[PDB]
Amino acid sequence: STAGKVIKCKAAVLWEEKKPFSIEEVEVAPPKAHEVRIKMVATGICRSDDHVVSGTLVTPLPVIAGHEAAGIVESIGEGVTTVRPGDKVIPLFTPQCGKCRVCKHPEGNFCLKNDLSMPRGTMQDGTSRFTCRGKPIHHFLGTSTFSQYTVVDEISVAKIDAASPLEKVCLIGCGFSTGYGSAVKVAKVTQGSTCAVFGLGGVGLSVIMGCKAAGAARIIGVDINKDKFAKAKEVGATECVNPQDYKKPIQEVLTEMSNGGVDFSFEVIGRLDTMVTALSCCQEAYGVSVIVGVPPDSQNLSMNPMLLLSGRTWKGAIFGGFKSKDSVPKLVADFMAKKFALDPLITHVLPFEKINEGFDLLRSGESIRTILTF
Amino acid sequence: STAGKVIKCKAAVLWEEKKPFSIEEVEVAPPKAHEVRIKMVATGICRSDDHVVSGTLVTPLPVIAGHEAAGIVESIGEGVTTVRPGDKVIPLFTPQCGKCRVCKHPEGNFCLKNDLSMPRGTMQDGTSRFTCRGKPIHHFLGTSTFSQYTVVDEISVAKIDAASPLEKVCLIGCGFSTGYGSAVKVAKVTQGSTCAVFGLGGVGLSVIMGCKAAGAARIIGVDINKDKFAKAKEVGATECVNPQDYKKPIQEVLTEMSNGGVDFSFEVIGRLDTMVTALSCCQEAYGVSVIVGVPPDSQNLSMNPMLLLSGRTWKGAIFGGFKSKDSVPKLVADFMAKKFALDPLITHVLPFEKINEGFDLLRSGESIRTILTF
Numbered sequence: 167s168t169a170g171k172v173i174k175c176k177a178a179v180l181w182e183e184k185k186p187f188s189i190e191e192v193e194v195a196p197p198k199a200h201e202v203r204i205k206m207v208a209t210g211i212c213r214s215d216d217h218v219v220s221g222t223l224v225t226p227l228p229v230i231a232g233h234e235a236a237g238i239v240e241s242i243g244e245g246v247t248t249v250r251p252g253d254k255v256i257p258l259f260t261p262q263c264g265k266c267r268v269c270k271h272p273e274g275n276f277c278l279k280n281d282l283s284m285p286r287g288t289m290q291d292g293t294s295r296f297t298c299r300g301k302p303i304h305h306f307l308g309t310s311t312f313s314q315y316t317v318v319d320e321i322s323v324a325k326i327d328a329a330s331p332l333e334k335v336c337l338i339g340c341g342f343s344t345g346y347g348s349a350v351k352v353a354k355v356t357q358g359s360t361c362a363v364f365g366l367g368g369v370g371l372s373v374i375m376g377c378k379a380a381g382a383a384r385i386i387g388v389d390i391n392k393d394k395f396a397k398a399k400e401v402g403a404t405e406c407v408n409p410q411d412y413k414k415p416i417q418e419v420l421t422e423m424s425n426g427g428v429d430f431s432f433e434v435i436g437r438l439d440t441m442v443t444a445l446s447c448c449q450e451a452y453g454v455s456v457i458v459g460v461p462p463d464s465q466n467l468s469m470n471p472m473l474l475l476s477g478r479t480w481k482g483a484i485f486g487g488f489k490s491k492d493s494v495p496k497l498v499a500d501f502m503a504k505k506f507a508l509d510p511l512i513t514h515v516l517p518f519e520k521i522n523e524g525f526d527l528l529r530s531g532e533s534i535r536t537i538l539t540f
Numbered sequence: 541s542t543a544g545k546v547i548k549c550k551a552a553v554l555w556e557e558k559k560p561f562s563i564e565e566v567e568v569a570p571p572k573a574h575e576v577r578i579k580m581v582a583t584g585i586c587r588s589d590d591h592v593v594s595g596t597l598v599t600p601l602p603v604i605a606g607h608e609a610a611g612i613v614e615s616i617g618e619g620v621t622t623v624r625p626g627d628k629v630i631p632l633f634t635p636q637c638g639k640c641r642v643c644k645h646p647e648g649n650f651c652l653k654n655d656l657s658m659p660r661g662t663m664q665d666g667t668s669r670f671t672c673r674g675k676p677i678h679h680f681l682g683t684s685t686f687s688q689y690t691v692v693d694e695i696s697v698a699k700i701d702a703a704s705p706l707e708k709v710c711l712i713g714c715g716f717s718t719g720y721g722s723a724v725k726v727a728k729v730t731q732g733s734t735c736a737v738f739g740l741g742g743v744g745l746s747v748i749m750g751c752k753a754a755g756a757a758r759i760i761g762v763d764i765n766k767d768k769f770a771k772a773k774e775v776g777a778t779e780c781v782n783p784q785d786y787k788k789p790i791q792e793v794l795t796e797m798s799n800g801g802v803d804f805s806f807e808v809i810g811r812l813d814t815m816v817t818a819l820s821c822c823q824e825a826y827g828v829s830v831i832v833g834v835p836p837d838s839q840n841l842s843m844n845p846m847l848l849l850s851g852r853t854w855k856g857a858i859f860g861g862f863k864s865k866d867s868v869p870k871l872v873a874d875f876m877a878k879k880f881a882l883d884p885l886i887t888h889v890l891p892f893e894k895i896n897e898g899f900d901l902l903r904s905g906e907s908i909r910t911i912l913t914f
């Protein structure tokens with residue numbers, strides 16, 4: 167049995183920026199009080215994990231990346247009461263400590279114990295659980311799911327339904343809940359509205375799903391990769407525009423199409439220019455624009471504040487505004503009751519050992535979500 | 541008597557940027573169909589009128605500026621049904637045509653027939669009702685109240701109570717309703733919150749009045765002119781802070797004071813640096829920042845979109861988010877019912893002839909609102 171001992175297993179270590187992941191053996195220490203050690207069953211490849219490789223999202227290296235996943239609890243550290251060995255679980259990259267100012271606010275979800283605004287790459291106690299070649303390896307956002315086993319703090323894990331298909335509900339760990347919640351909880355899309363969605367990857371297709379569920383009358387998908395359009399129409403887009411087809415700037419096209427501006431726009435790419443374009447194409451007196459894409463580290467955008475003075479609302483959010491530990495169980499239960507589908511988002515399923523191939527699929531624009539199996 | 545005839549009267553004409561207002565004799569043509577000619581009784585000096593003089597707010601020159609005012613209907617053109625000669629009225633710089641998409645929308649108020657986004661400086665039909673020295677003079681936001689008589693379109697005028705003190709309720713034409721609605725209607729301040737208000741002029745003090753009326757527990761006024769602090773506390777500020785007293789950025793000071801950031805912040809000055817500072821000092825996961833101040837024409841601010849990604853909401857609004865023709869009669873009725881005070885905002889009452897003296901009071905920081913009486 168493994169409880170109490172170091173597990174040696176394989177993990178994908180990123181030793182340096184802009185390098186392939188190196189699949190190698192690491193040592194995963196046992197859990198300390200209030201930590202949980204998890205055997206990974208499936209993990210999705212989110213564009214935020216590629217942001218680490220490219221240096222767009224800065225976190226300490228070497229690191230085991232990965233954050234959108236599902237597995238089974240192998241052991242719990244002392245004091246853990248919310249999961250038991252054998253539970254199916256989803257690691258939470260946004261924690262819910264339940265005690266801070268944000269967790270006690272009815273609307274906020276960006277818990278102050280997060281490791282995303284000032285990343286240390288450690289557990290909540292400042293140390294690591296991973297050693298590879300004798301060197302300590304950093305954690306990524308308290309999850310690190312590109313490993314056969316990982317250790318997370320209790321505030322970063324949610325127990326889910328024991329009948330859950332883990333190779334599908336891992337997308338509730340990030341991509342799906344983020345896109346769905348950006349439409350129904352953050353922007354609060356109204357019945358009958360026109361929505362525009364910039365970027366049709368896994369999280370953008372989930373935003374179209376949330377707008378369709380809120381009853382939007384028109385949903386315009388925007389992407390420069392026209393191969394994404396058939397899938398966009400399938401999950402709800404009423405029409406799709408490729409910015410490269412036009413000689414005039416896309417916010418002009420979108421304003422003429424929606425007869426002076428859309429009600430709701432979403433930026434789901436992570437570029438500074440498209441964030442300003444997404445704001446501009448919503449109606450100037452009552453439009454709402456939501457930023458979902460992760461921008462490059464430390465770079466500033468430039469915009470004209472009259473865009474907001476006329477009455478526009480601009481907002482952003484992490485994880486679709488959901489308090490993670492409260493919501494993830496209820497979102498898996500709704501999946502189970504067939505309230506939404508995850509299957510349109512999964513285009514490829516690969517063994518973990520093919521992780522580099524999975525990332526090339528994302529980078530070439532051939533996949534929406536690739537699930538890696540252990 | 542004057543109905544149907546051209547009236548020659550005095551008006552303050554602004555012939556060029558950065559010059560004094562010239563008191564001249566102008567001729568005011570009679571009301572055409574659906575227009576109304578008003579005898580001015582009292583008009584306030586708002587900082588947006590000083591923005592036309594400095595070139596901050598670009599509008600066609602020469603112009604008769606002035607937009608915050610109350611008067612009496614002298615004659616009405618063919619087809620007017622909403623007022624009659626002898627009615628007390630407040631001109632509306634934001635019209636309510638009742639027919640465009642914004643007017644039909646339950647929440648927007650920036651009617652598409654406004655002359656503020658791309659100022660032509662004319663009546664709704666493209667012509668002017670003013671002549672001075674044989675030259676046509678432009679209108680300002682369909683109001684032009686620095687004149688003994690003015691002509692407005694019917695969609696830019698509200699009939700108010702016959703017992704109104706016109707020298708007091710002209711503030712509802714702009715400063716008061718803007719600051720008050722920015723708090724209770726645009727930001728929707730909640731009972732128990734902490735608010736921070738950048739700028740303690742007439743509009744900034746009306747924001748403090750809305751925050752207090754909405755139940756804020758703490759209202760931090762911020763101004764570099766410490767002489768405004770007494771009146772700020774008189775209308776509701778719990779504390780005032782002057783940026784120059786500190787050795788560290790005021791965003792750090794205000795985040796320390798509020799234990800991590802305020803709930804609602806308001807920029808009521810019109811500067812690109814304080815708009816970004818007001819956004820940064822509200823709590824990162826659920827704070828709301830409202831831009832009220834008019835920024836300098838054509839200038840861009842620079843900000844890091846991670847300030848929004850964590851959960852903040854950034855919004856702006858014209859005239860406090862109120863549908864003008866619907867709301868102004870109702871706010872006068874509430875003023876009559878003693879529901880709010882206007883007297884704390886009026887610090888100087890001058891004859892119309894001393895208009896430049898009133899502008900120098902504002903620019904030196906000695907007045908809050910000066911009312912010019914005719």
Ligand SMILES: NC(=O)c1ccc[n+]([C@@H]2O[C@H](COP(=O)([O-])OP(=O)(O)OC[C@H]3O[C@@H](n4cnc5c(N)ncnc54)[C@H](O)[C@@H]3O)[C@@H](O)[C@H]2O)c1
Nearest residue numbers: 213214365366367368369389390434435436459460484485
């Ligand atoms: N806010 C959050 O909590 C959160 C959570 C998950 C993902 N993200 C971020 O959301 C963004 C999308 O993630 P994803 O996994 O769906 O990514 P993805 O790479 O699968 O999709 C990005 C899409 O944007 C398109 N695109 C690129 N440039 C474009 C352009 N200039 N104009 C129009 N379309 C363009 C691409 O073709 C692609 O279809 C990323 O920045 C990711 O980091 C944020």
Ligand SMILES: NC(=O)c1ccc[n+]([C@@H]2O[C@H](COP(=O)([O-])OP(=O)(O)OC[C@H]3O[C@@H](n4cnc5c(N)ncnc54)[C@H](O)[C@@H]3O)[C@@H](O)[C@H]2O)c1
Nearest residue numbers: 587588739740741742743763764765809810833834858859
């Ligand atoms: N959104 C709207 O519909 C609307 C309506 C009315 C007025 N406005 C705009 O609101 C702004 C305020 O109007 P007002 O008439 O109350 O103006 P005001 O001049 O009376 O008040 C401005 C205040 O800001 C202070 N100030 C200047 N620089 C500052 C800084 N660096 N830091 C802190 N405080 C500073 C001044 O001391 C002054 O007390 C103006 O830009 C005006 O054009 C907008």
Ligand SMILES: [Zn+2]
Nearest residue numbers: 212214340341
């Ligand atoms: Zn992700």
Ligand SMILES: [Zn+2]
Nearest residue numbers: 263266269277
């Ligand atoms: Zn918390």
Ligand SMILES: [Zn+2]
Nearest residue numbers: 586588714715
């Ligand atoms: Zn004004």
Ligand SMILES: [Zn+2]
Nearest residue numbers: 637640643651
């Ligand atoms: Zn209208």
